[PDB]
Symmetry: D2
Subunit: 350 residues, 4 copies
C-alpha cells in the first residue's frame, strides 16, 4: 500500500512527480487551490477519462496551505505513507512585493502541514519531503555549494524557505518524524512557469521566429545558474524517501552558465547570432544577420538583493542514492525552444 499526498500538484514539479509515482503503482492524492477558472492544465491528462474528468488512481482535493482545518481533514481521509510539500509562492522577484503572503504559505504553511500530520496520529508512519532550495545559499559562502556550506538568504522567499528548512529539522529531532530537506538547484522544462527566465527566453525567441513579437526586455544578464531538467529532479525526491535514514541532500548538475549565454544559445536555434552593445540598463542584443534589435534591459526585472552565482556539488547524493542528472544545459535549451515554437505556431495567444 503506497499512498502519496502532493501539495503543489498543479505546478511544474508536482505534475512530473504525479506521473512518476503513478507509473510505480501509487495511489496519488493532490491538494488543489480553488480557482475562478481552470488551473489543472499540467495534470488534466492523468484522469481515467480526461474528456469527462473522471478520476482513476489520481484524486484531487480542494485546500490551501493557509487553512489549518482543511489540511487535517485531507490528511485524516487520505492517511498517506508519503507527503511531498511542493506547494509555495515560488517566484523570487514577486516575493519582494508579496513578502507577507510568501512568509505565510512557504514558512508557516510548512509548520501547518507538519502539525496536521501530528494531530492525525501519523508522526511515526509518514515520510515527509520538504521542497528546500539553493536560494538558501544566497550570497554564496563557498564555491561550489554542498550540504555543509552555510546559508545566507537574499529575499523574502529565501527567508521563508529557511524557516521551513529548520522547522522540518525540529520535527525530525523532537518527535522522530522521517522528514528530509531536498536542497534542489534550478530545474526547468517545457512546463516551467512563463515568468522564470529560461521559459521567458524560449517563449520570446519562438514568438520572434514566427513574427508575433519584435523585441523583449530582461533584467540582470550576468547572473549565473546551475540548470537541470525537472523530470530528472523529481526522481531524486522519491529516492530521498526510500533511504534507510532521513538525510538532507543537494541535487544539481555542477555546471554553470549565464543568462546572457541562455539568450545566445536560444537564438542560434532560430538561425540568429546575438551581438551585444551598450552597458548597464542601456545594453541591447542585436541580430548580426539582419541588424534588428531583439533584446533590451529594464530595471523593473532586477532584484533589490541579487543571488549572483549558484553551482551545486551533489557528490553525497550520487554516492548514497545513485542519482545522476541525464539532461545537460545544451539539450535543455534545444528542447525548450523547440517545444515553444510548436506551441506558438499552433496558438499565437499561448
Amino acid at each position: 500500500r503506497n499512498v502519496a499526498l502532493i501539495t503543489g500538484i498543479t505546478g511544474q514539479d508536482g505534475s512530473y512527480l504525479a506521473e512518476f509515482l503513478l507509473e510505480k503503482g501509487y495511489e496519488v492524492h493532490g491538494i488543489v487551490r480553488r480557482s475562478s477558472s481552470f488551473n489543472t492544465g499540467r495534470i488534466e491528462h492523468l484522469y481515467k477519462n480526461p474528456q469527462a474528468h473522471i478520476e482513476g488512481n489520481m484524486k484531487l482535493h480542494y485546500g490551501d496551505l493557509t487553512d489549518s482545518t482543511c489540511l487535517v481533514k485531507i490528511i485524516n481521509e487520505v492517511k498517506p505513507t508519503e507527503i511531498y510539500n511542493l506547494g509555495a509562492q515560488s517566484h523570487v522577484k514577486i516575493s519582494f512585493d508579496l513578502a507577507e503572503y510568501t512568509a505565510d504559505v512557504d514558512g508557516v504553511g510548512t509548520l501547518r502541514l507538519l502539525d496536521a500530520v501530528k494531530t492525525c496520529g501519523l508522526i511515526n508512519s509518514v515520510k515527509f519531503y520538504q521542497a528546500s532550495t539553493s536560494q538558501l545559499y544566497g550570497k554564496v559562502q563557498e564555491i561550489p555549494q554542498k550540504e555543509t556550506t552555510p546559508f545566507y538568504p537574499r529575499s523574502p522567499y529565501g527567508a521563508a524557505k529557511l524557516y521551513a528548512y529548520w522547522i522540518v529539522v525540529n520535527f525530525r529531532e523532537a518527535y522522530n518524524l522521517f522528514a528530509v530537506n531536498g536542497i534542489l538547484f534550478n530545474h526547468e522544462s517545457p512546463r516551467r512557469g512563463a515568468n522564470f527566465v529560461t521559459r521567458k527566453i524560449s517563449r520570446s525567441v519562438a514568438k520572434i521566429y514566427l513574427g508575433q513579437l519584435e523585441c523583449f526586455s530582461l533584467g540582470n544578464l550576468d547572473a549565473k545558474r546551475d540548470w537541470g531538467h525537472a523530470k530528472d529532479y523529481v526522481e531524486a525526491m522519491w529516492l530521498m524517501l526510500q533511504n534507510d535514514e532521513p538525510e538532507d541532500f543537494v541535487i544539481a548538475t555542477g555546471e554553470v552558465h549565464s543568462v546572457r549565454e541562455f539568450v545566445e544559445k536560444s537564438f542560434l536555434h532560430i538561425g540568429k547570432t546575438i551581438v551585444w552593445e551598450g552597458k548597464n540598463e542601456n545594453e541591447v542584443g542585436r541580430c548580426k544577420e539582419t541588424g534588428k534589435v531583439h533584446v533590451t534591459v529594464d530595471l523593473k526585472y532586477y532584484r533589490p538583493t541579487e543571488v549572483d552565482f549558484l553551482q551545486g556539488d551533489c557528490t553525497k547524493a550520487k554516492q548514497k542514492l545513485n542519482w545522476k542528472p541525464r539532461v545537460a544545459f545544451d539539450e535543455l535549451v534545444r528542447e525548450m525552444v523547440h517545444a515553444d515554437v510548436e506551441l506558438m505556431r499552433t496558438n499565437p495567444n499561448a
Copy 2:
C-alpha cells in the same frame, strides 16, 4: 480623472466590468493572484498587443486580499477614484470545507481593503463598491426579497459575506466613506465558472451532443433561482457609484426557474426531450426519443443547509438608477449551450 481598481479582475464579473470601464475611457487597474500557470484567460484580449502581451489602458498588479502591505502599496500608487471589491472564494459548496479561508478572504479581506483606503488618506475621495449577494437572504424570510428583507445566512460563504456587508455600512456611517452594497442575485454567462450549476449543465449537455459523455450527476433538482446575464449586471455596479448618494440596491430579474427547468431547456437545444422517473437520490432523466439515461442524482452534490428559493425585487433600482435587465432566462440558456457546443468541438476537455 477616472481611475478604477478592481479586485477579482480575472473572474467572470471582473472581466466584463474591465471591458465596460475601458469603453467609457477609464484607466483600469486590477489585482491578480500569483499562479503557477496563466490565470488571465478572461482578460488577455484586453492587452494593447494580445500576441505579445503588452499593456495599454489596463494595468495588472500582483496581490492578495490576505496580504495587508500589498493592498496599501497598490492603493497608494494607483490613487483610484473608484474601487470594486469583487475578489472572493465564491463557491458555496466549497465554502463548507474551506470555511476558514473563505472567512479570511471574503470577510476580513473586505475590512483590509477599507482600512487601506483609510491609511492612504482617501476616505473623502474614493467611491467603494462591495460585492454583496442574494445568499445573505438564505432561508428566505419574505417572497420576493428586497433591500429591507431580513438576512438569514446558510453557509460559511453567506456568514463571511454578512460580515463584509456590515463592515462596509460601518465605514459609511463612521467616516462618511461613499461605500455601497450591491445585493446581486445569480448571474451567468459563457465565462461562468465550470463548477456552478448552469455552466455544469451547458458543458455536460455539449459533451453529450458530441457523443463524448453518456451521463452526468446533479444534486438538488428542485432548487429555484433568479438567473440574469453578468454583462447586464456589471453595468448596475457602475451606476451605483454614479449615484449622488451612497445607497444599497438589489439587482435581479424578478423571474424564478428551477435547476430541473434549466436541464430540460438545455437538452431541447440539442434535440432531446428529457422525461424524469423515480424520487430523491434515485431520480433519473431519460431521453424520450432514444431511451437513454443522461442525468442521475448523487447526494455528494447536495449542501448541508440548502438555499431552496431566491427571487429578487429590484423596484428601488428601477426607480433610482433606471437599470433594467436585457437578457431573459430563455436567451441565457440558448447562449450558454450554443457557446459550449462550439467550444467542445475544438477541445474535448473543456
Copy 3:
C-alpha cells in the same frame, strides 16, 4: 461526567462562571493566554493551593485548540474569549475580527475535527451590541440586528456561524444575547468601573477630577454573577435555543455618575453642554467631572433595554440585582480597595 472548557476564563464572566461550575462539582478547564506578567488575578483563589486546570492557548492558533479539546474531551464549551471593548475595536478592527469572529469558527471546527459534534454542548457569548440602532423598545429575540462597530460586526459573524453549525450538523449550540453586566471585577476601562474607581479616589483625596465621553447614552445594567447562571441554564435546556438575558430597566451614564457621587455625600450639578459640559459638587463648589471628545465612539449605540420573557418562561431565570444596588456595591468596593491599597 461534567467537564467544562471555558475560553476567556481570566475575564470577568469566566471568573464567576468557573466558581459557579466548581460549586456544582464540575471539572473545569480554562484556556489562558501567555503573558509576560501575572494575568490570573480573578481566579488565583480557585487553586488547590485541584478541579480547575489551566492550558496555554489562543483563539488564533488552530493546532492548540484541537490539542486542548482532544485532551479534555469536554461535555460543555463556553466561548467567552474575546477582545471585548467597543471603543478599542475601532483602532484594533482586524485583530477584533480575527479573535471574536474567525476565532468562533476555529473553535467550532476544532469540535468537528475532534469528533465531538454529537456529544458537546456549545455556548456562544453573543451580545446586545447586535441591536446597535433600534426602533423596537424593549428589544427581544425577534428584534432585527444592526451592528455599529467592528466589535458588533465580528460578533454578528460569530452569531451566524454558530447557527450554521447547529442547522448543518445538528450541533447543540446556542447564542446567549446578553445585555451589559458589571461587578467589582469589571474591567477598569468600562464606564461603570471607570466611574466607581474615580469617585472613590475623589473621596479619599487621591484624585480631584475626571473626564467622560457621551453622558446621555442609555443602558440596561445587570450583575455578572446573575448572568453566568443563565449561560449554564441554556445548556441544560432540552433543545438548543437562543435567549435574551437582561434586567428590563434602563438608565443613563449621567444617572450612573449622579448616583455614584451621592454615595460619597455629593450632589452633582451640571453646567454647559456637549464637550464643554461639567459636573460640580453643590455643597463644596468643586468641579469633579468634565467631558472629552476622545472618549466618544464614531458610531454610538444610543439606547439598550432588554425583554427576557422567553428566558423567564423556558429557563425560569430572573435577575436578582438592579441598577441602584449595583451602583452602591461598585462604589463601596472601590472605596475599600483604594483605602487598603492606593495603587490598586
Copy 4:
C-alpha cells in the same frame, strides 16, 4: 529630535529600556496589548514623556497607524511570545508574532516613507545557536535552532538582514544571551527558583519541582543589556553583536547558590526524575524533578564571546552570576514579606 517606539514595553527589557531612554530625555512611545486585567505593572511608576498605544504584532493596520503618527527616530522590537517551553504547544502563534510580526514592523517603516530616517533594533537571541557548533559562541558561529521559538527568531534575524541589504535601512540584530532581574517572568528558571526559595525562607512554601538540572547557561542582568541595545543604534554603521557575560553555570548551581543565601545547603540524592534536593542542616526535602518541565529538544550549553562588542561599542557587563543570584533572592524575600500573594 529623539523619539523611541518600543514594542514589548510591558515586558522585562522594555521596562528597563523605557527608564533608560526617559533619563536621556527621549520621548518614549510603547505598544501595549489590550488585556481584560491590568498588564502595566512594570511601568506604572513612569506615569509626561511616556505615551502608550493599543496594538498587536499581528494587526497590520495598527502598526502603520502608530508608526505614521509617532514618526520615531529609533524602533526597538522587543515584543514576542518569549517562552521556549510554551513555544512547543503554541508553535503557530509563536511563528506569527516572533517571525512574521518582525516583517510586519519593517514593512510599516517602508510604507510610512521612513527607511532613511529610522534606526531599527531586533531582539535576536542565543537560542539561535541551539545545538552549539563551537564554544564559546561568537557572531560567526553557525546557527542551529532547537524549538519553534528558535526557528521563528531565525526568520526574524534574516528578514532584518534583508531590509538592511536591499533598502539601506539602518537595522541591527542584538544576539543577546540570557538576562534576568527582579522583574524577570516567574515562569523562567531563575525567577522560579528565587521566588520559591524566598517563600521557603518565610515558611510560605515547603517544596518545588524543576526539570533538567544539568542545563548550562550564561546569565547577566537586564539593566546592563538594555544599554547595549541603545549603543548598537548609536554606532556609525549597522552591525550585529553578541552580548553576554562569558561565564557559564548549571541550573543545579543556581539552585545551590540561591539556597545558601537563606542559610541552607542543598545535597542531592537519586537519579533522573527521582532526584531530590535535601537541606543538610534540617534533613527536609525542598526540590523535586518532574519530566513535564523538560523540552523535547533541549539547548544543553550556552556561553557567549562578546569581544566584538567590547572592541566596537566599549560595552562590558557590570553584574555577574554570584551578584545576580544574591540580588534576585533578596528582592523576592522583601517582596514576599511585604505581600504574601505577590
